[PDB]
Design a protein around this motif. Structure first.
Motif, PDB file in Angstrom:
ATOM      1  N   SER A 253      -8.173   6.877  -1.945  1.00 40.55           N
ATOM      2  CA  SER A 253      -8.244   6.068  -0.734  1.00 40.55           C
ATOM      3  C   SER A 253      -8.905   4.746  -1.113  1.00 40.55           C
ATOM      4  CB  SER A 253      -9.021   6.794   0.358  1.00 40.55           C
TER       5      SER A 253
ATOM      6  N   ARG B 242       0.829  -1.191   0.000  1.00 36.81           N
ATOM      7  CA  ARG B 242       0.000   0.000   0.000  1.00 36.81           C
ATOM      8  C   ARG B 242       0.868   1.247   0.000  1.00 36.81           C
TER       9      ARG B 242
ATOM     10  N   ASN C 230     -10.091   0.613  -1.305  1.00 36.47           N
ATOM     11  CA  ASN C 230     -11.061  -0.172  -0.558  1.00 36.47           C
ATOM     12  C   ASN C 230     -10.351  -1.238   0.256  1.00 36.47           C
ATOM     13  OD1 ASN C 230     -13.480  -1.249   0.365  1.00 36.47           O
ATOM     14  ND2 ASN C 230     -13.940  -2.362  -1.544  1.00 36.47           N
TER      15      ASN C 230
ATOM     16  N   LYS D  76       0.770   4.291  -2.850  1.00 38.32           N
ATOM     17  CA  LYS D  76       0.388   5.678  -2.547  1.00 38.32           C
ATOM     18  C   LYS D  76       0.624   6.622  -3.720  1.00 38.32           C
TER      19      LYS D  76
ATOM     20  N   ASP E  13      -4.093   9.895  -5.633  1.00 39.29           N
ATOM     21  CA  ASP E  13      -4.633  10.413  -4.378  1.00 39.29           C
ATOM     22  C   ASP E  13      -5.848   9.633  -3.883  1.00 39.29           C
TER      23      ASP E  13
END
Length: 30
Positions: free
Chosen positions: A17, A6, A19, A10, A15
């Motif tokens: 978010s 993760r 699941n 990034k 940008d």
DNA sequence: CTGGCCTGTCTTACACAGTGATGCAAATCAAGTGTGAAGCCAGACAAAAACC
């Protein structure tokens, strides 16, 4: 591993978010 | 037959244990509330581990 995946993603996803279910699937699939 | 002189009782000095009271410094309380820090939730899943 999942934290590192993760962290690398990034910037892959600029940008977003991501699941919980789908990110699990992706880290699983690698 | 009477000392000096090498020995277990006697006699208070003396520290102090510990009493309820005291006295001063420092928490504490009480109100207002908006924060920030913190453990938890959910689901698909894979590590690091012991059981046949």
């Amino acid at each position: 591993f999942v934290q590192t995946c993760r962290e690398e993603h990034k910037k892959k996803h600029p940008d977003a978010s991501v699941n919980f279910s789908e990110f699990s699937k992706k880290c699983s699939e690698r």
